[PDB]
Design an enzyme around this catalytic site. Structure first.
Site, short mmCIF file in Angstrom:
data_model
loop_
_atom_site.label_atom_id
_atom_site.label_comp_id
_atom_site.label_asym_id
_atom_site.label_seq_id
_atom_site.Cartn_x
_atom_site.Cartn_y
_atom_site.Cartn_z
N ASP A 155 0.83 -1.20 0.00
CA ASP A 155 0.00 0.00 0.00
C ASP A 155 0.86 1.25 0.00
O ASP A 155 1.32 1.68 1.06
CB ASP A 155 -0.93 -0.03 1.22
CG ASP A 155 -1.94 1.07 1.21
OD1 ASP A 155 -1.90 1.96 0.31
OD2 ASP A 155 -2.86 1.01 2.01
N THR A 156 1.06 1.86 -1.17
CA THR A 156 1.90 3.06 -1.22
C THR A 156 1.24 4.25 -0.53
O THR A 156 1.93 5.27 -0.26
CB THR A 156 2.21 3.38 -2.69
OG1 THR A 156 0.97 3.56 -3.41
CG2 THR A 156 3.04 2.29 -3.33
N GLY A 157 -0.05 4.21 -0.27
CA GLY A 157 -0.74 5.30 0.39
C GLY A 157 -0.70 5.22 1.88
O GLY A 157 -1.27 6.09 2.56
C1 LIG Z 1 -4.21 8.31 3.31
C2 LIG Z 1 -4.96 7.00 3.32
C3 LIG Z 1 -5.07 6.45 2.02
C4 LIG Z 1 -4.08 5.99 4.03
N1 LIG Z 1 -4.72 4.73 3.98
C5 LIG Z 1 -4.09 3.83 3.05
C6 LIG Z 1 -5.01 3.43 1.87
O1 LIG Z 1 -4.21 2.69 1.03
C7 LIG Z 1 -6.26 2.63 2.34
C8 LIG Z 1 -5.93 1.14 2.63
C9 LIG Z 1 -7.08 0.54 2.96
C10 LIG Z 1 -7.65 -0.41 2.14
C11 LIG Z 1 -8.86 -0.98 2.46
C12 LIG Z 1 -9.53 -0.65 3.64
F1 LIG Z 1 -10.83 -1.29 3.96
C13 LIG Z 1 -8.93 0.27 4.49
C14 LIG Z 1 -7.72 0.86 4.14
N2 LIG Z 1 -7.33 2.63 1.37
C15 LIG Z 1 -8.55 3.19 1.42
O2 LIG Z 1 -8.94 3.85 2.31
O3 LIG Z 1 -9.37 2.90 0.36
C16 LIG Z 1 -10.74 2.68 0.49
C17 LIG Z 1 -11.47 3.47 -0.50
C18 LIG Z 1 -10.77 3.44 -1.86
O4 LIG Z 1 -11.53 2.69 -2.79
C19 LIG Z 1 -11.83 1.41 -2.25
O5 LIG Z 1 -10.52 0.73 -2.11
C20 LIG Z 1 -10.27 0.46 -0.77
C21 LIG Z 1 -11.25 1.25 0.08
C22 LIG Z 1 -12.49 1.43 -0.86
C23 LIG Z 1 -12.86 2.77 -0.53
S1 LIG Z 1 -4.97 4.19 5.56
O6 LIG Z 1 -5.31 2.72 5.46
O7 LIG Z 1 -5.99 4.91 6.08
C24 LIG Z 1 -3.56 4.39 6.41
C25 LIG Z 1 -2.64 3.36 6.41
C26 LIG Z 1 -1.47 3.53 7.10
C27 LIG Z 1 -1.27 4.59 7.81
N3 LIG Z 1 -0.18 4.88 8.48
C28 LIG Z 1 -0.25 6.04 9.12
N4 LIG Z 1 0.73 6.50 9.90
C29 LIG Z 1 0.71 7.80 10.54
C30 LIG Z 1 0.93 9.03 9.63
C31 LIG Z 1 2.04 8.53 10.51
S2 LIG Z 1 -1.67 6.80 8.84
C32 LIG Z 1 -2.22 5.56 7.84
C33 LIG Z 1 -3.34 5.46 7.19
#
Ligand SMILES: CC(C)CN(C[C@@H](O)[C@H](Cc1ccc(F)cc1)NC(=O)O[C@H]1[C@H]2CO[C@H]3OC[C@@H]1[C@H]3C2)S(=O)(=O)c1ccc2nc(NC3CC3)sc2c1
EC number: 3.4.23.16
Lengths: 99, 99
Positions: free
Chosen positions: A25-27
Site C-alpha cells: 500500500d503506497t498510500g
Molecule cells: C491516506 C490514506 C489512504 C491511508 N490509507 C491507506 C489506503 O491505502 C487505504 C488502505 C485501505 C484499504 C482498504 C480498507 F478497507 C482500508 C484501508 N485505502 C482506502 O482507504 O481505500 C478505500 C477506499 C478506496 O476505494 C476502495 O478501495 C479500498 C477502500 C475502498 C474505498 S490508511 O489505510 O488509512 C492508512 C494506512 C497507514 C497509515 N499509516 C499512518 N501512519 C501515521 C501518519 C504517521 S496513517 C495511515 C493510514
C-alpha cells in the site's frame, strides 16, 4: 517482481511465526495488521484514515518477511479491515512505483 | 518516472480545470478526492476504510490528468483526509510496483 494494478497487490507475509496476506500500500505511511498474536511489549497509538481513527498497538523492531524479503520495523496491530504493508517496510524491500 | 517510497508518492493532477496534489495509492481500489467543484450529475455512494465509512459523490467518465498522463474514469468526491489516486486510474497511466 513487477506487479501491475488490475487486481489488488496482495502478497504473502510471515510475521510472528504466522502466514498472512497483505496489501502493498503506497498510500500507507505505516504498516497496519489485523488483530493477531505478537510477543512482547507495545505502546498504544491512534492512527487516522478515510472514515476516522482506530486505536492500535505499536510494536517496534518486528521481523516480517514480505514476499520472500526480510524487513525489520514497526508494525501496528488493530482493527484495520485489511492487512496493509506501508512505506516504512516497502522502502526496506526496495519497492518502487513506475509509470 | 520511477518513484521510490521514502516520501509520500504525491503527484500533481488536473481535474475539472483545477490543479491539485494527490497520492498514488496502490491500496485504494477507487479514486477519492477532497470536496471540490465538479460539473454534472453524480450518484451517492458509501466507501469504507480504516476508521469507518464516508459518504461520497460518484462521478463517472471524468477526465483527469495525472503527472502529465490523461485518464478518464470514475472519481469519488467527499470527506477523505487526502486526495487519493486509486487503481482504477493507476492502471490507465501504466503504473506498476517493482521490487
Ligand atoms: C491516506 C490514506 C489512504 C491511508 N490509507 C491507506 C489506503 O491505502 C487505504 C488502505 C485501505 C484499504 C482498504 C480498507 F478497507 C482500508 C484501508 N485505502 C482506502 O482507504 O481505500 C478505500 C477506499 C478506496 O476505494 C476502495 O478501495 C479500498 C477502500 C475502498 C474505498 S490508511 O489505510 O488509512 C492508512 C494506512 C497507514 C497509515 N499509516 C499512518 N501512519 C501515521 C501518519 C504517521 S496513517 C495511515 C493510514
Amino acid at each position: 517482481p513487477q506487479i501491475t494494478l488490475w487486481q489488488r497487490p496482495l502478497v504473502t507475509i510471515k510475521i510472528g511465526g504466522q502466514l498472512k496476506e497483505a496489501l502493498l500500500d503506497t498510500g500507507a505511511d505505516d504498516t497496519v495488521l489485523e488483530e493477531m498474536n505478537l510477543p512482547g511489549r507495545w505502546k498504544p497509538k491512534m492512527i487516522g484514515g478515510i472514515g476516522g481513527f482506530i486505536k492500535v498497538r505499536q510494536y517496534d523492531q518486528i521481523l516480517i518477511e514480505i514476499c520472500g524479503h526480510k524487513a525489520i520495523g514497526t508494525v501496528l496491530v488493530g482493527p484495520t479491515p485489511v492487512n496493509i504493508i506501508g512505506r516504512n517496510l516497502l522502502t526496506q524491500i526496495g519497492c518502487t512505483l513506475n509509470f
